[PDB]
């Protein structure tokens, strides 16, 4: 039942809400990702959906987050990308606008995460090898 | 070689065994999950198997068991769901009968597990933010 407390909404229902409020519905978006010519077309659609999901999972796997909807990384943020306040982003901006703003700097963050993960992995292996 | 010690059984050979003994053979079941019209028929079967496996993997991924066969959770078990002894379920019942009895409450348990894991992720992230 709807009330003054929490709200359920639907798939892609928090697209117009701020990032802070939209971060609570990360599970609903993730759980919905999954005549011979027509058979080829249907199989193509299913295969493409599987490749996209596998690519996203692979990208997550390369980083230090095996599997979880929210995870933390050990690299500081660079103002050069945004420079915006902390509270002003989560409480006054939606996900679409933020994505549009960081779209020109995604590849750099994607490379930095991989670099940090490789360094952390080798350091952890060396640290654990002193037993 | 067979003997008075442990037995190996086969693929789904532990179906007649109790839940306690069948829980030791969880790896064998999990490791066996993977004319143009004929080509379509074979590709359809292959894609169906891949989709089913990815579905189960996604369900495990949403929870805190993305990479292990046996994992514990934090939600307690309400007595109304079964009101049966622990020793009698593991040592006097099989998976087929237990699955038949709990089939009417699987969706509720899945929803509770998903919500609990989401809340736990938010709590861990909030606590980790202090450091």
């Amino acid at each position: 039942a709807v009330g003054i407390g929490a709200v359920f909404l639907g798939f892609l229902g928090a697209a117009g809400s701020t990032m802070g409020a939209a971060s609570m519905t990360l599970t609903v978006q993730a759980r919905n990702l999954l005549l011979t010519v027509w058979g080829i077309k249907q199989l193509q659609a299913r295969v493409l959906a599987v490749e996209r999901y596998l690519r996203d999972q692979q990208l997550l796997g390369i980083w230090g987050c095996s599997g979880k909807l929210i995870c933390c990384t050990n690299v500081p943020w660079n103002s050069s990308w945004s420079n915006r306040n902390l509270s002003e982003i989560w409480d006054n901006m939606t996900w679409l606008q933020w994505d549009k703003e960081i779209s020109n700097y995604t590849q750099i963050i994607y490379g930095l995460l991989e670099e940090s993960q490789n360094q952390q992995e080798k350091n952890e292996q060396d640290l654990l090898a002193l037993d | 070689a067979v003997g008075i010690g442990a037995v190996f059984l086969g693929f789904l050979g532990a179906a007649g065994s109790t839940m306690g003994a069948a829980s030791m053979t969880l790896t064998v079941q999990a490791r066996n999950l993977l004319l143009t019209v004929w080509g379509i028929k074979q590709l359809q079967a292959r894609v169906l198997a891949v989709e089913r496996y990815l579905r189960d993997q996604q369900l495990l991924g949403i929870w805190g068991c993305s990479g292990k066969l046996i994992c514990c959770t934090n939600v307690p078990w309400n007595s109304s769901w079964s009101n049966r002894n622990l020793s009698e379920i593991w040592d006097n019942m099989t998976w087929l009968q237990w699955d038949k009895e709990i089939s009417n409450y699987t969706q509720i348990i899945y929803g509770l597990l998903e919500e609990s894991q989401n809340q736990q992720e938010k709590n861990e992230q909030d606590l980790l933010a202090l450091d």
Partner: nanobody
Amino acid sequence: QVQLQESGPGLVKPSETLSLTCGVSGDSITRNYYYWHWIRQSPGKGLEGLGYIAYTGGTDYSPSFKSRVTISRDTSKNQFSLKLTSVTVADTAVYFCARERGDSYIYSYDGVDFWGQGLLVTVSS
């Protein structure tokens, strides 16, 4: 098992305030995604929702009772009460304190789970 129990005066004269208290046992009033309503039943008129208090502490009242109903909570002893001013003879009905289901960010749940024993309130002189 979760159980609710009402308490308050049985006979109340006209024109003064009304006070009822519903206790909660077996469950915490501070539950993350649940609500607590107050409903009354009378012959002919049916059921009416006076109001409810959410887990956040906020209160929402019905349009026909907002000027007279008032709800408050006491998390220290795990109980909540309702105060109704300007009682009339038409208010003579059985009062029920019940718990409901809020829509979580992940799933939506609807339905009144438990109800009270229905303390009968008689407004006469």
